[PDB]
């Protein structure tokens, strides 16, 4: 006892022993030893700091000075979280909890906050050997905060919950059309493609849905979205996708498509094999060679400047692409009926001419303009329209291309206008390319040419808005106006010319989306001018 | 270099017997595309430029005045500096 | 050492010993004092178990919390002295200094009081008269606080200045009676600037 | 055995940049099992090949099945059994370079071995676990034979 | 930045040292402080030589004419001894440093011991000494040769 | 390549495919699938975890058809024996892949005592019918 007495007194001689966590046990041992507590109290008289009270006093000082209680609480909680991170012991915690034999309330107090929930998750992941961590995870689930427990990789191991959440996500996708698919697609694709087995079952179910010839376009689109999201993660399942379809009846074509999509490149040998198969009297289902990745490979190889392809297989590549795109086949009950070959010779000739224009880059743009009749005749093919779209995208994507582009209203944007006029399916793509063109701020050009290009891009956006693709264009224009990335005069010109060319009556959707645009002061103080026909004034009076 | 279907020797294979000793040199052909080194196939030239000589063996490349004439660092200069003057004389005679 | 805490109602070690001297059960009293009037957050009392069972006594993070909240308070008061309205922030700092001169006698919180008093460009008369009576409190004062002290204390300012003049005279005499006699360097050789 | 490497390839491409030389063609080939890629020059005049053809490639360090070494001198009047009897096309070169995805900290995973057959180059590229017998400045053989299957 | 990261020869990254040197050498270059001080002094001399060069050769002209072709000699040594630049090498860097230091003394243009002759000899071979040090480094002898 | 025994085969499979973080089948399955391992799976398949069975089933498809042709019997046998487990997942995958050794494609049969499958198919079909 005397040795323990000396040890306890030496502990008491340390600074501020009043703030010990086992001070109850230390005092119990001192009482058991029979020593008088007078020495302990005398030592603690000089060894007590209000390290539990002066913190509150300084917190009150902080509140009075101007510090909001929210930040004070956040700082205290963050410091306590760090201290808990640095001071965890599994086995003594387990022993103390077994001695307790019950569920502590202070653990529930920790569960109440999110920071301690994340700390408990990190602790549970750190040491698999501690039962307390699974205990706390179970209690968090019991308290209703099982959402904080990891579920991004848990849904892959779960069959029914994953299937039902997939059902709800797809139903919500079909509720809002594309405008809600664009939002519900990221997380849904993440959860579906996180596990390969869930990916495969999703593809199997979705393709079985796509079997029906009526309404199957959206189903095929969603399946392709899942496939491309899986591919984006570097995860490849193209061969399984081919095996899901009707590739069995054509093993050679299945081989060629699988090899190309596995490598991601086009080899002349398999191109020649496909040419032999399709040119023969028994072509396979054209839908199999219409995979977005495969057509993208054709487009990239046949249109990208700086990429070279064999001149002895150029016509075979063009023929295969033309047969893939323009040729129409009649099908009933998964059986072929007839094949349309109307757009086979002229389509091939147009693709050949456009590819010659694309890959013969050393010719100036003036020569491109000089052949405008043939150019505009051949641009009416939607696949060729997308080809020239992305060819222009890649040419102007060069930082030094603008210096070579010597027109205030360049012919490239005229080609984009023709593309928008010809087809409405490319209008989302036209809007995307226009957004990329406008958002690209150039520092190696004079601001005068920057302003000219931005005005011409505004004209292009006005044209796109005119042809019926309005809502995303309007939303993007409002975002740019509120984003300060667009000059005030630019939006002034855009809105003024829009209200100049458009005519009433305006729909409720357009009025709703356009009223906040005129709400901004940059327009109210500029476009509002003294005139008998004021665009902002007339639009407001129309409401 | 080719055993079956019939024995065949290559011009570079025979010429390596002319290069004396163990001589290491790297040159470039007159018609070498300057943009080949940056891209792939830098060490395997499609046009057989980029003369490389290792241990007195013509690994690859096509010889021209840029590697056999009176240029600094050419093959004969390397032969003179590394070997003696007699061996270089034998080299000159053997080539012709 | 722990004086001045009693003024604000936060009892220090003196009243602690006074209360526990005539107390039979220290366990419940100390638990309530560290729980009831302590940090009024379930977070800290709920963190006490884990930090206890780690083997590192709770005194360590208690002291760390006190010191880091002190530092955060000081830095935020410094920022407030240079943010917002000048008169409003100065009045808030005056209130803080008036309520910290109760704890000015605490060396672990003396930096708080001294830094906040530095934060005030013009300390009121009575608080200056209080601080200048103590040697260490007088010596720890900032340049502005010392300026306020000397602006209305002629004799003390002269006493402060006198040793510097003595050093100046000693250096001048040593230079005038320098052993090194040459025209290259002399008493009048150096420029007035240096 | 001294068989450094053995796998099946198919001619996925022919000389893409064009016909640089009359009697030599540049073969681009892909494997089946190890997923290798191959770049090869062949004497197209005596061993004609076509697109889509398949062949067995057996890079051996020696032509004698017993495994003994050779001086490297042409001795046509030899009697020992040889691997060349069951192969159509044989080269004999010397690896001159071995690249890879090496970093300053960890080892390589994808390797690339170049061997020159008296002027006709060849690049073998793949995963590090296969190109182990390839060490620079060592003579090897090619021993390829077409598979009619 | 590039000059330092290409000539420093850091002696703290153990994993990087593993690929280049054997165990008995990486432990020696990691534990001993005399070696580290010597190599840091070598890098300081490197930087001093760089400063001298940048006033000797303005306009950034790297081409120069010097007696021995160091790169070709290194290549010849590699081909003679079958280095196999894939495995770790048994080359203690201090051997390289002190070998270069000793070799510098053996190349004499002005022979003598009085300060005038020593200064003349130091000048007459200054460029060759700078080049020789700049190739036969400690990092280059371990990461490049 | 030896007929490494049953429990040892299961341990090897759970060592090569036991990464729970890697929920995707590795590209190594092209070389990891040989006759000995597949044959030994005939008894150690019970010793494999559900994730191991799922990943093995996914990786069975990533094979060249020459290997498939020369491993017809082993692949059909492993499919059949995987079609006799407690996991409905492995049952369905074995049924879907039974067609691969014969035609090279995948079977598509549904609406068979799978509540999630039937409900999802019905709701998506009616939803598409709403907005064709």
Numbering used by the authors:
A (entry chain W): 40 to 582
B (entry chain A): 578 to 673
C (entry chain V): 1 to 194
D (entry chain H): 2 to 150
E (entry chain A): 914 to 1058
F (entry chain U): 1 to 132
Study text:
The metazoan transcription elongation complex (EC) of RNA polymerase II (RNAPII) generally stalls between the transcription start site and the first (+1) nucleosome. NELF is a large, metazoan-specific protein complex consisting of four subunits, NELF-A, NELF-B, NELF-C/D, and NELF-E. It binds both RNAPII and the nascent RNA transcript emerging from RNAPII and inhibits transcription. DSIF, a conserved heterodimer complex of Suppressor of Ty 4 (SPT4) and SPT5, is required for NELF recruitment and RNAPII pausing and also serves as a processivity factor upon the pause release by NELF dissociation. In the present study, we determined the cryo-EM structures of mammalian ECs containing RNAPII, NELF, DSIF, and/or TFIIS stalled on a nucleosomal DNA.
In some of the NELF-containing classes, RNAPII had advanced to collide with the downstream nucleosome, and we reconstructed the PEC structure containing RNAPII, DSIF, NELF, TFIIS, and the nucleosome (PEC2-nuc). In this structure, NELF binds RNAPII in mode 2, simultaneously with TFIIS. TFIIS binds the rim of the RNAPII secondary channel, in a manner similar to that observed previously. There is no apparent contact or steric clash between TFIIS and NELF. After stripping ~20 bp of the nucleosomal DNA from the histone surfaces, RNAPII is stalled within the downstream nucleosome. The leading edge of RNAPII is positioned around SHL (–5) of the nucleosome, consistent with the previous in vivo observation. In PEC2-nuc, the NELF-E basic helix directly contacts the nucleosomal DNA. In PEC2-nuc, TFIIS is indeed bound to the exposed binding site. Thus, the PEC2-nuc complex formed near the entry of the nucleosome strongly restricts RNAPII progression downstream beyond SHL(–5). Thereby, NELF and the nucleosome seem to cooperatively restrict RNAPII progression beyond SHL(–5) of the nucleosome.
